Symmetry: C3
Subunit: 235 residues, 3 copies
Amino acid sequence: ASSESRLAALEARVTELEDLNAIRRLQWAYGYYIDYNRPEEVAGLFAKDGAVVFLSGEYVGYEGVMRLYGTWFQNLFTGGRRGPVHGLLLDHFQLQDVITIAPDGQTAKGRFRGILAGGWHDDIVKDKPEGMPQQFWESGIYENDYVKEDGVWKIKRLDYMMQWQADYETGWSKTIAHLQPAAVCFPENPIGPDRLLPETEVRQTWPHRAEVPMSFAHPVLAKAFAVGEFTKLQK
Amino acid sequence: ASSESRLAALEARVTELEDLNAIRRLQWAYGYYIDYNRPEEVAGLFAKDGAVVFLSGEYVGYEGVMRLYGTWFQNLFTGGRRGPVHGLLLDHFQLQDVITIAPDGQTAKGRFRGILAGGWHDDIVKDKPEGMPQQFWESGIYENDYVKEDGVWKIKRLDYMMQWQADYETGWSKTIAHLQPAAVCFPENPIGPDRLLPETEVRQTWPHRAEVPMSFAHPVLAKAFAVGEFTKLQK
Amino acid sequence: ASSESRLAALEARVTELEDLNAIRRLQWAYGYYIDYNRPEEVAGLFAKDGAVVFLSGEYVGYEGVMRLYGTWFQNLFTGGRRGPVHGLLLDHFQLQDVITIAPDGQTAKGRFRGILAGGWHDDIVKDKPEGMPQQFWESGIYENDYVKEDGVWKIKRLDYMMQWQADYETGWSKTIAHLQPAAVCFPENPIGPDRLLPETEVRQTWPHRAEVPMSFAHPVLAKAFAVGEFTKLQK
Ligand SMILES: Oc1ccc(/C=C/c2cc(O)cc(O)c2)cc1
Ligand SMILES: Oc1ccc(/C=C/c2cc(O)cc(O)c2)cc1
Ligand SMILES: Oc1ccc(/C=C/c2cc(O)cc(O)c2)cc1
């Protein structure tokens, strides 16, 4: 290839490596904001026509993102204060990024997950809502969408599918999630979604389980991967 | 240097950054497959002359990988069903990659680790084998080998060295691993390895401990690192 | 742009991607060393005029780093032996890197965090100091400084701000940290810091909380981010 072909090929390859970093950074930054109950910084990560999906409900735009992370999560955990605050733990450990940039470099998908250690210390337990566990673990999978807007990566769709909860004292095997897929929309429900997902995308919560399909192709076999050939070797 | 020297140097540097991403992606993808008890997708990540090492035993090729992840782990946790399934948690959180690409770019090593949250919900506990903990934590270190085959990175050797287990209710300090280094080979043992490791590589399990040497050089001092100079400053 | 402008721009972009990898590798390598109570390898990661900060106290140079990781942590957990050792767990799971390289490429900052699973098995509990929990969780945030010295990235300042502790049996909501911000300097205190932080940087420990400001700019809005505009949308 010519020097011009090689320079252009290197520019495209280096942009894709930068894109992957930038998308990972959005999720890791998102984590550090939500650990502090700081919904503004979270809302700022989104494209203006973006959305967040939580318990099979869509929260649209800056308004929806502030309703979920502010009106609901902040009022629940800190009584409507930017955190962190005395005795309140809400650590959403973020990991295991598998990001796929579209061929055109203008959109992307990414799989991630979180494990949360949460709760109210004995010092502040009188501030905990009746009905909330004092201390708990949660984990869920993210399958998110991203857009590159005027050369900046932003969150287009954050889709958090909670997978399991555990009361600290009892564990996942003895815990039922009280949170269930959304049934009531905003404004009837002041902390509810703009719209429910379609029935085919509605997920029941722990201990109910459903696959979250991979946004990534099989990294070795791509579309050549077929389950059945391998299954023949199992007993 | 000439434009040709600079282009070739940039091509090699950008390939090495892509190689590191690709190798990390194999381990993160491996994780998301094993969380769903999907052994086929796991087997597909391996070179055909690859192997997996588990409890000081080698399982060779697609056949061995399907025996460990299918005949053993899938039959144990889901009764031989592709997951996920109701009430069954098997989340192997993957992290802390330190990858070393060979100078020739055709092989690699990588250190990783996993922490597992596992168990049977009360809803399905009657499906749990007698003798298994209802709910547990495990963690282990991976020191893996990779090959670049026809321009695609694949797993050559996955070596998972379990380090500790904890019953959920009691913790690591009160838990003994029932799993011990392999003693019986397939086919006598229908879920056993093709071959045992050599005695010098056999690891006893928690609370027994043994170092897993680092596949990476000291990242600041490389071969110039010597323990004793520093030890002089400790009291 | 000319071929020369494009080559130089690509060299700078590829160096920045390599820099980010190298800085992440320091923290991940640091983790694997401290899990083995190997302070020498930790000390080797530091610039000679580097420091480590722990409980609002600065430990300067190789001498200080060996005092904290050797004289204190190694003597505490393994009785002054390089690990790992029978029945002693000290796994500092490292994750969630957000690294910012200075424009000149000669320094960097990075946010990270750790979650620790620690303790003495029943087999060795008679070796545990009176007053230590047999088994516990801890987590903290790192905001670190790095220098590129003769083309090698090194730790200039490791600042570990412990955020929460939990006795295994009781959880974070029922645990008070016994560790408090440093009050006594070395040499009066044989395991104490060279210097205390200034009062304005002193942190009280769990369940006391204080923000650890982000070393990174808002990744979408940068300095254009303002909290108040968004807060208007919350109820
Ligand atoms: O073990 C557990 C049992 C119940 C729960 C409830 C969680 C919860 C979390 C939210 O963010 C909002 C909310 O309204 C409820 C969590 C853990
Ligand atoms: O706390 C614990 C006590 C015992 C165990 C046993 C684990 C185990 C895990 C496997 O994948 C297969 C198996 O046959 C056994 C796990 C946790
Ligand atoms: O639940 C917990 C209660 C107390 C502690 C104390 C921790 C500790 C950790 C160190 O590295 C050194 C030390 O002198 C003390 C930890 C956990």
